[PDB]
Ligand binder design. Structure first.
Ligand SMILES: Cc1cc2c(cc1NC1CNC1)N1C(=NNC(=O)[C@H]1C)CO2
Ligand SMILES: Cc1cc2c(cc1NC1CNC1)N1C(=NNC(=O)[C@H]1C)CO2
Ligand code: NA
Lengths: 333, 309
């Protein structure tokens, strides 16, 4: 399989994560989102291990209804490709910029579906570490899909901990900022930050530079407006406990919190509770719910630093190729 | 303490007056770097002992700033001097000027803004740069500028301190240097004017068939500005090409408040939040090859960034 077998119609986004294209396989009317990376960029950014972690985690994640599904991965001399399911609902950052903040029932629904996704990852010994609004995609019906697993730590079951400094600044837990060894607790602090931003429409911690922001994360009390529902406030107070072992998600049973009192968790996992927000989606190949800056730009793969790629060790991305049983059936035919 | 055996020299990127630049990989980590290599006997012949030490001392201070070339570590063998640098494959600005003749106003404004930040950092640290030019500005893979080659710097230039040695690349040298005057950071702002003029117009502001005529033009001729040039770009260049240093913009006034940099948020620029308007298409526009083959005391140094790796 090669990229020439796909027709790259539009570019949905670019950035540090690479380039994401709306791709159609041949002329089968079967659409996909292809994340296309350049090997030389990956090497200079020191994202070799991060790329392999993303492949491995997406190999676990095809079961779970609220993690992004990967159909196949493959590589050329210059390129690394992930062929994903195309989720044209739009990400939560895109939707929250428009409406400023989410209503209580919508934020609760998203919070509940994210809990199922995170608890699945944690059960497999995976700590996610990069939970944020623009890493949560919506599908055509409005169910959440957690995305971007390159920042994960695997093999975290049992009495296991890790210590490396990573994540997005607004969402970084204080235990990471203080240089402590940590476990899945870091995801639940980030979850609280995400939930706060959905409900309140701004971040709970602030600063003019990173130093003030990290001080705020370590020291400052989150602000709860008078209009905020009390059970929403309670959950956030139980999530913003700086002692990791006393934080909800690590301690207690987060599903039994009164915020999710109307939520049947078995029904939610089976996709049987209707999302309070259904995105506008005309077709399976619609591009309405994406920033228009990228869409208008012509889809293309960059050139590569030939001196770097020729001098590179080829076996860095060994065992990168993957393919589920569905893709083999829709290739040979 | 690091050694050359810890690296593996893969391919040669450049060769000339700045020694030889090699693309090198670290032994176990597979982390790629640019290594600049100088022969000691060659450096002693050219009388650039002090120049090499000034480069090391400036590159030690310059690890913090985003638009200066980052040096990870320096070390020496019996015959060679090595600077372990971050690998910057975007290409130098002389290459990109030669590609498209001139940069448009947005591209020229962006590069001019990032150069102002880099220069003003050096000036606040007591470093007058003195060799600003297109081929000493490297781009990273994203498109951000990186000021390189600090061998011609002068240290301890804080407050009313001055120096008097004749130096710089002919097209860019200030009148006060040509007039043999005791000068300060003002010389960088003249050179900035020349570099900015070349980006917008695609030719040098001062001309001559030899140095004698070129230096006369620098001292006497006012530069030509075409009709199509934007009035704000012209205005900044006119204020930059003042021949009395004290009246020059950069020395006098605040260069960041000029109408050319109207849309530029200076803090967001310095944090690298504003994306470059030009990403390089060609990757590593440099000539590539196979590999083949006590005045320098206190040359060894290692930045705390390298200590992590
Ligand atoms: C910008 C962007 C657009 C995308 C998608 C992702 C992004 N950007 C990433 C950065 N965080 C979301 N995806 C989509 N579907 N499925 C996926 O797995 C990914 C490739 C839809 O389009
Ligand atoms: C010709 C040349 C090639 C280079 C580099 C420099 C040059 N030439 C110099 C002359 N002005 C740029 N560098 C690079 N990365 N970082 C650096 O500091 C230097 C060593 C990449 O390759
Ligand atoms: Na504060």
């Amino acid at each position: 399989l090669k990229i020439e077998d796909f027709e790259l119609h539009k570019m949905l986004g670019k950035g540090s994560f690479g380039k994401v294209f709306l791709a159609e396989f041949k002329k089968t009317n079967q659409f996909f989102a292809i994340k296309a990376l350049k090997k030389d960029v990956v090497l200079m950014d020191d994202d070799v291990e991060c790329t392999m972690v993303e492949k491995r985690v997406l190999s676990l994640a095809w079961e779970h209804p609220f993690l992004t599904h990967m159909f196949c991965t493959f590589q050329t001399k210059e390129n690394l490709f992930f062929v994903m399911e195309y989720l044209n609902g739009g990400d939560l950052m895109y939707h929250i910029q428009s409406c400023h903040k989410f209503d209580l029932s919508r934020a609760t629904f998203y919070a509940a579906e994210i809990i199922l996704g995170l608890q699945f990852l944690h059960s497999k010994g995976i700590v996610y570490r990069d939970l944020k609004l623009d890493n949560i995609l919506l599908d055509k019906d409005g169910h959440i899909k957690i995305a971007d697993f390159g920042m994960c730590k695997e093999n975290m079951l049992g009495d296991a901990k890790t210590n490396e400094f990573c994540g997005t600044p607004d969402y970084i837990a204080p235990e990471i900022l203080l240089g402590q060894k940590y476990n899945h607790s870091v995801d639940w602090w980030s979850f609280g930050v995400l939930l706060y931003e959905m409900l309140i429409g701004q971040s709970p911690f602030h600063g003019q530079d990173e130093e003030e922001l990290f001080h705020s994360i370590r020291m400052d009390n989150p602000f709860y407006p008078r209009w905020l529902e009390k059970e929403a406030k309670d959950l956030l107070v139980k999530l913003f406990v700086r002692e990791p072992e006393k934080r909800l998600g690590v301690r207690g049973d987060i599903r039994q919190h009164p915020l999710f009192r109307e939520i049947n968790w078995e029904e939610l996992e089976r996709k049987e509770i209707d999302p309070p927000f259904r995105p506008k989606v005309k077709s399976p190949f619609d591009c309405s719910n994406f920033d228009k800056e990228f869409l208008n730009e012509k889809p293309r793969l960059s050139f590569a630093d030939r001196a770097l790629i020729n001098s590179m060790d080829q076996n860095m991305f060994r065992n990168f190729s993957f393919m589920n049983p569905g893709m083999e059936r829709l290739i040979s035919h």
